[PDB]
Design a protein around this ligand. Structure first.
Ligand code: 2TA
Length: 127
């Protein structure tokens, strides 16, 4: 089978705002995770065709990845910081769901999640 279309990253019908928290999510959180040595499996939608994973999109029905999150942030797609944090959580939980405890890919996600949570603990109060 084909891959699904990627998640939406722009919708001109959606209102936009910039907030200090969304700025921090792009400029600090996403920038820090992106450069991590384990970030590469998470930087774009899973290409189940190229990776030969016929069951991936049978199991993962709410796909998410950092490439999508980056594009959402750069497009001002998100209104609330919590939408973006939810997308990161979806990405990490999808990894845990598809794979098994102690798999290398799971240890990679665990390391990125720990860093994510450290950076979110420093999320500035909304202004
Ligand atoms: C976000 C994500 C979540 N879970 C997975 N799990 C996963 C994906 C592919 C897997 O394929 C096993 C056999 N292939 C591994 C490389 C040779 C053939 C096994 C597990 N991959 C993910 N992303 C991913 C992205 C690019 C490449 C790869 S990979 O195919 O190189 N698989 C890993 C070695 C990283 C597990 C995986």
């Amino acid at each position: 089978s084909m891959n699904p279309p990627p998640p939406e990253t722009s919708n001109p019908n959606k209102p936009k705002r910039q907030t200090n928290q969304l700025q921090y999510l792009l400029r600090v959180v996403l920038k820090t995770l992106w450069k991590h040595q384990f970030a590469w499996p998470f930087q774009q939608p899973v290409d189940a065709v190229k990776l030969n994973l016929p069951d991936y999109y049978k199991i993962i029905k709410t796909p998410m990845d950092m490439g999508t999150i980056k594009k959402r942030l750069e497009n001002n797609y998100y209104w609330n910081a919590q939408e973006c944090i939810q997308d990161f959580n979806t990405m990490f939980t999808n990894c845990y769901i598809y794979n098994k405890p102690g798999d290398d890919i799971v240890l990679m996600a665990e390391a990125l999640e720990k860093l994510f949570l450290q950076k979110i603990n420093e999320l500035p109060t909304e202004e």
